[PDB]
């Protein structure tokens, strides 16, 4: 029968969703109070959502807040919401995207699906309502963070690298996306294609970050080379490389704006200057955190006090960057932790993911 075959197709879709454009919906809260996005402002997390950079003195805590779980496999990307830490997003490798309240809440705020491969990278827009997830299927999908529906999708000829949003408020739909075949594309969501293409970088891109807002963006390729290029410009006049590092899988900018952390493949965290003298200090490096060939998140805490790095065995390393020495090491859980971000709301909390499918809040 037709309705019987519809019920059989519903049972088959239930089996496919248990196996893990069709998206899931997380929790029954949806829009809270009079109606707002779940990734905009939860108005329930600790401290101040509209706080400044340095909340207090940064200290390394040894605790666990949320185990989260939800993801069947290890999430390749773990990011936060815009401005405040009222929401955390995990790009689960079973073609899933989850958003949670990032304050110890076990229920996920939002869910999204529709991809065919593992979601490699996740990023958010300047407003915080659009989330662009780039997977291994040579396509990046921009979806709504409050409904999970895919607003747009942009394909590429090569495999998709880490796609980031521009730091300029005037260019919010212009996403910088890397490619496997030695390309960096500043692609507009309104245009639908690559507005600007840069083939000067050699190899597949690894991480694209903003060293300065609307002046120069730093892209790190598969080789140990970081190139700072302007948006929609043909020539790049700033590059950093050395014959000791093997690769640059992670390049991030500190919240203070005084230095940039590059987790090189030679078990070092190179501190590069965030000014026009973009030089990496050989003395100011972190050899106590090992990064051999695995991508991580070499991030910074408030007021340039601590630097957080990840390892493939699951042990996170926190270093006093003011003292330039490894202060603490957290060895919780039996899963591999790569991404780690200190909370902008409270200075005693961090957010990380695991390879067992659990997101850990400390």
């Amino acid at each position: 029968s037709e309705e019987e075959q519809k019920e059989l197709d519903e049972i088959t879709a239930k089996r496919q969703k248990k196996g893990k454009e069709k998206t899931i919906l997380h929790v029954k809260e949806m829009y809270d109070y009079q109606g707002r996005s779940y990734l905009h402002i939860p108005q329930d997390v600790g401290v101040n959502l509209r706080s400044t950079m340095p909340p207090e003195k940064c200290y390394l805590p040894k605790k666990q807040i949320h185990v989260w779980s939800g993801h069947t496999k290890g999430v390749s990307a773990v990011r936060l919401f815009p401005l405040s830490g009222h929401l955390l997003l995990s790009c689960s490798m079973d073609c899933k995207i989850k958003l949670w309240e990032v304050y110890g809440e076990r229920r996920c705020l939002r869910t999204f699906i529709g991809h065919s491969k593992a979601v490699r990278d996740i990023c958010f827009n300047t407003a915080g309502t659009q989330f662009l997830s780039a997977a291994y299927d040579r396509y990046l999908k921009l979806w709504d963070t409050e409904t999970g529906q895919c607003i747009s999708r942009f394909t590429n000829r090569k495999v998709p690298y880490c796609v980031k949003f521009n730091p300029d408020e005037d260019k919010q739909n212009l996403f910088v996306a890397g490619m496997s075949d030695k390309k960096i594309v500043q692609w507009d969501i309104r245009s639908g294609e690559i507005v600007q293409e840069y083939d000067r970088h050699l190899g597949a891109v690894n991480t694209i970050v903003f060293v300065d807002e609307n002046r120069r963006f730093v892209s790190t390729s598969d080789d140990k080379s970081l190139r700072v290029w302007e948006w929609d410009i043909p020539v790049d006049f700033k590059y950093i490389a050395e014959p000791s590092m093997h690769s640059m899988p992670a390049v991030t900018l500190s919240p203070n704006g005084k230095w940039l952390a590059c987790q090189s493949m030679d078990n070092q965290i190179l501190i590069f200057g965030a000014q026009n003298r973009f030089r990496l200090n050989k003395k100011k490096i972190f050899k106590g955190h090992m990064v051999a060939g695995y991508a991580c998140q070499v991030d910074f805490s408030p007021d340039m006090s601590y630097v957080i790095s990840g390892d493939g065995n699951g042990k996170l390393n926190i270093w006093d960057w003011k003292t330039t020495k490894l202060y603490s090491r957290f060895k919780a859980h039996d899963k591999v932790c790569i991404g780690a971000v200190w909370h902008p709301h409270e200075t005693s909390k961090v957010i990380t993911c695991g390879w067992d499918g659990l997101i850990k809040l400390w």
Partner: peptide
Amino acid sequence: KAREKQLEEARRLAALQKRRE
């Protein structure tokens, strides 16, 4: 003896690495 114990320790380290991964 000691080399076998070091190989067993390296195999245990690889076992915890595979369990983490």
